[PDB]
Amino acid sequence: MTITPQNLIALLPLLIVGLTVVVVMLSIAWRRNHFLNATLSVIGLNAALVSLWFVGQAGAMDVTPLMRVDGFAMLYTGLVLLASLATCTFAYPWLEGYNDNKDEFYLLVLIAALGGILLANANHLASLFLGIELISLPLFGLVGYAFRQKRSLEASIKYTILSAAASSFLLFGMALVYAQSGDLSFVALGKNLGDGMLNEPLLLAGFGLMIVGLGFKLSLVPFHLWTPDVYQGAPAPVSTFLATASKIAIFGVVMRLFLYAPVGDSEAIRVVLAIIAFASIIFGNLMALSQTNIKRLLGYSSISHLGYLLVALIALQTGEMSMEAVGVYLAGYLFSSLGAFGVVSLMSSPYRGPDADSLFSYRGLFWHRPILAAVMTVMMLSLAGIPMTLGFIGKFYVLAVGVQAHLWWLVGAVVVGSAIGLYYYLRVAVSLYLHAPPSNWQYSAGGIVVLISALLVLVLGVWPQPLISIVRLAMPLM
Amino acid sequence: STEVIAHHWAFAIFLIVAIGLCCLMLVGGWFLGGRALRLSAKFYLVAMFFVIFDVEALYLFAWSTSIRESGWVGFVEAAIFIFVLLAGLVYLVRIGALDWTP
Amino acid sequence: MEFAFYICGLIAILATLRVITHTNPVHALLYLIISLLAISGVFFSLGAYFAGALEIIVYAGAIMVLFVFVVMMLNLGGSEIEQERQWLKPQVWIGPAILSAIMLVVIVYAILGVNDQGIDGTPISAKAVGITLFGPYVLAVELASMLLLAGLVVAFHVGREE
Amino acid sequence: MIPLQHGLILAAILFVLGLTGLVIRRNLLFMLIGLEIMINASALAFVVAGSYWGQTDGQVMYILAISLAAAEASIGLALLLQLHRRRQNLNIDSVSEMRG
Amino acid sequence: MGKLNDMVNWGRKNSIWPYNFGLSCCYVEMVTSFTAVHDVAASPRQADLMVVAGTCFTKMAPVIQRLYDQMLEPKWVISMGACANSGGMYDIYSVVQGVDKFIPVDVYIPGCPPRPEAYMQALMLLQESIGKERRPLSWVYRANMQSERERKRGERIAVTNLRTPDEI
Amino acid sequence: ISPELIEILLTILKAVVILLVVVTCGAFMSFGERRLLGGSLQLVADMIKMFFKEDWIPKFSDRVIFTLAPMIAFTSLLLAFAIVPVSPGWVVADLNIGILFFLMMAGLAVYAVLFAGWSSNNKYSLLGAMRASAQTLSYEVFLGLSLMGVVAQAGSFNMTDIVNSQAHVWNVIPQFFGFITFAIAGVAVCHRHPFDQPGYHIEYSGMKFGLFFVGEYIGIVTISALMVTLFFGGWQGPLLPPFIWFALKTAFFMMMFILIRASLPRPRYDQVMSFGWKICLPLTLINLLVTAAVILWQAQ
């Protein structure tokens, strides 16, 4: 398909982020200025975020055999851009203490945001694969950005090796699917079959290997073991980005894949995803019980919350409000993880050398950082699914969707995992309120970001109608 | 046909005769006659730059054989590709990654 | 044409098996280059002329050069590699080989139950790849340039010396 | 003339061999080698599938796959050099400081 | 068989690459030999002739021995000048008295220094020695050649009058 | 006995004739550059000495790598020559990939330098080989990009299509910057002597040294013939038979390489890296862009 100028209007956030990459790289080539390059990165991300409105004026259509732009694409592009802006905002105070180069961080964050936007607009196996790699490789750089630190180098090596293996699995599965189907478009995966011949073995095996790669990327059991190690070893703004934007973009493109594919409603694939979601919920809640480190605890939290999202995804073919539920849960989980990892990033900034620790020490935080402690306890209550928080609205959506489609094992899994989550999140909150023995406007901007996230979580927990209205407004092409 | 299979036979004969020629050259050489610091990281950097720019060159190889069929649209797309490539090259030059002299 | 496919596939399988079991890294990389040439011959036997050309140009001519360069820079004169031979102990390799054989059996069982009309081997030239590359698939081209830039920046930041 | 299942079986064999090499080797270099074998086998599978259907998308997916292979090899070898610089060994069992 | 050995020795004699490892004044004469006014027309591993041209000191002798050992068969040695032949005028504590104390020598050149035409004459002598002996064709009996002294005796003793030193 | 079998045998004989001629011209022009700075009897004598020299593989070195580096340095550029058309009806392989096969052979040919460096087992030799390999990577990064203007004007990768597209005007006139960048790249990746040393030929003795010597001069023959067939019409000429034109142009470029060796000094290594990464690569990209613009502008 050719590209008309209206298709370029639908291409707007991708173009603006790519031009931002080029401009930031040319500015680094001119002179290494940390403030100017961070400003250019956030200006480009804000420009893409506000160009989403001009994309919305254009309408839902297809720009390529590869990209399809609609309200679904706009919603997940907005979520990715919000996570990227928050990552840059948290990264500046952390990078102020980094004695080596600092602007390659912003370059890689921009490229990873570009991959997230491509995954948001994806309609093709080529675009899915390219978006996953475009997310993964800047994350290879960012997870080990402080490679002189031992844990950061360890996490970089682990994430690079395991993500290359997952990409190989995904690529081989896509190759088997293309061997069976003959077209790489999402709508044509299983279209040639019919009348009960949907469970073709090569198509199912290709989707299984794709599921292996994607479930690595989504921290789903049994491809989950990297998550606490990589989350702990990575720098804290990198942990923020890797928890929010990567998971959101990959789950959005997985939702598109299972919505458009005629094989997405296969009984075997549904049962396999049910087993993966059940094990993900239970294991990610059980492994976070005895966690004394906040980063590993949030990693197992990510496993459990992606399991809840997967439960919402299983009922996509049966129900109709599954896309709305996934959007509401993804907004809630985005703001919760942004607040939690932002508190961790602010208390670990500036980077105090590669030879020193990077620990958070959450005990007795309220007696010297009361606002951050309030934000962190609101985030822990939100991740527990407790009412008056947006995480409860997401959990309610997931349970309503599961009850509607008679997924009773998943409903019981959500209940049990929610109780276990209540235990460890409440332990973290009371540890914040127990007893224990900055000075620049970018740290203030990070604090403002986590505070606005906390206010959004509280307000949309006690009044979730605006979020539901703007999520139902984002309907994809049926 | 016969011309294409004749050229295939000629090319196969060329490859095997050249390889056998070098192999028997070494065989005759080995058979005849009597008998009685710290490696700098710049080499890895330039090799990796070669790998990356060779992949971009492969994309331009694909474009160059079908310039007329893609038209001015393909020219604009390839100009964007080449501009990103040149911006990366200017970046590598300016950060001293391609400067070998101190 | 099918003889070229079967011979090159056999050579690729044997060379890969020699790669994963060898102890000297240089000989392992040489066997890997041999396997890449065999896979390029497989590509040429299937009509994918551009794919085989890039298999020798890029995979066997750029990536393996980078691996060879790294092996040189490591100065491996028996630096805790050749002395161990730990992977040849059956308690180390028997389990993973069993697991990978089970995976191969499952994948082959999936493959054998597909409709097969055969590969005609009609040569798909690089002109068609360039037409479809800068036509329908051109956002893939631009974002693949961005992906290569990402790899460039990441590897430069990690692999400096200072 | 060449069955599609034969090319797919060849690609599956090479992918399985690459995965075995990735698992059984403690050396980081041979793990990167096994990763290259796996991604090249997946790219070969894409070429086989594209040549069966007569479409040009298989070689396009090959090109994207080898772009990923080149960039991942670059990043992995930079990480290997950093590990050899700051620990003077490439045994991956020693890189286990984060656990639990 | 007979013509084959002749062609092998012909190939060895018509292609000789010297490793001119000289140490003193004799080496500078051999540097002057390469110019276009004399028309005389590497590494020890591929060189087949070693031209030892200069004084073999007690400290330079291990270097000469190692550089000769690095060469490969067939190998030939030409000593140039009195120093390489016998130690020359330096019968002193710090000079090895002749390079043939530790490496075999195939052709000797008297002089101090020899002129480059003497080196070309020694190249001709070495070519004749190579062409007259024979080596095994595949995996050494050198020919006992007539000495140049007795061969040239008649035309040397037949000399009667020479130009006087007074004129030029 | 069939006419098809007669044609097959004639084509095989043509391929073997081309191979023997290119190898013999490599050896003969090796002696020619030796004498310019009878004689075939001297070349045969040198070949006999190389045959009967004691072939010695070092004790503390690998056997396979040390043996394989000269094999690469010979066969890579020989098979690179395997695509060059010398006359209508006189070609070894009329491949659809062509100049892609040349790029394949060059990318395999860097392994000769790398493997000689590994099998040298000397720190100075290994460092010099790392420098030489970095140089040939820096100058083969743009070899295909310099040829891409010619490929764009021809619209194909076939060499016969290229020399047929050079019918009205030789490609040296439009693709002049492509010509100079291909000349510099071919000079540097074949280790000609503005760029011969930044040595890795040490510890090679007898037949392996002869293989390196003959292989690099065969690479000079191959690059000269490719220069002719890519920028100077190939076989095309007004009056003379086509092979005579091809042979005289190829011999002119071999003598041009001799003059280049005898007429240029040695740039420093840093200058060589800076040139190959700052001037030639952007020049090749800009030349390809301008060539595409002119091609699309003229074909209204």
Ligand SMILES: CCCCCCCCCCCCCCCCCC(=O)OC[C@H](COP(=O)(O)OCCN)OC(=O)CCCCCCCCCCCCCCCCC
């Ligand atoms: C040290 C040596 C180790 C061993 C090396 C390999 C030895 C054996 C190689 C030769 C095997 C026998 C001949 C194989 C068939 C030759 C003909 C052929 O490939 O034809 C197929 C195809 C023709 O297509 P075409 O004419 O363009 O289109 C018309 C319609 N198809 O044409 C093509 O597809 C052409 C492209 C394939 C050409 C392959 C050439 C050889 C590749 C390996 C080079 C090895 C170099 C030395 C080692 C490097 C470092 C390890």
Ligand SMILES: CCCCCCCCCCCCCCCCCCCC
């Ligand atoms: C229910 C959702 C979250 C609401 C806000 C949670 C609390 C935010 C911080 C408010 C101030 C807390 C003060 C705690 C003082 C503890 C004193 C203990 C004395 C023994």
Ligand SMILES: CCCCCCCCCCCCCCCCCCCC
């Ligand atoms: C340096 C030149 C290398 C050339 C390699 C190929 C040689 C092929 C020789 C073919 C000769 C006959 C060509 C057809 C007849 C036209 C020419 C007649 C007068 C020579």
Ligand code: SF4
């Ligand atoms: S023989 Fe005479 S000229 Fe030669 S090195 Fe000895 S002192 Fe010098």
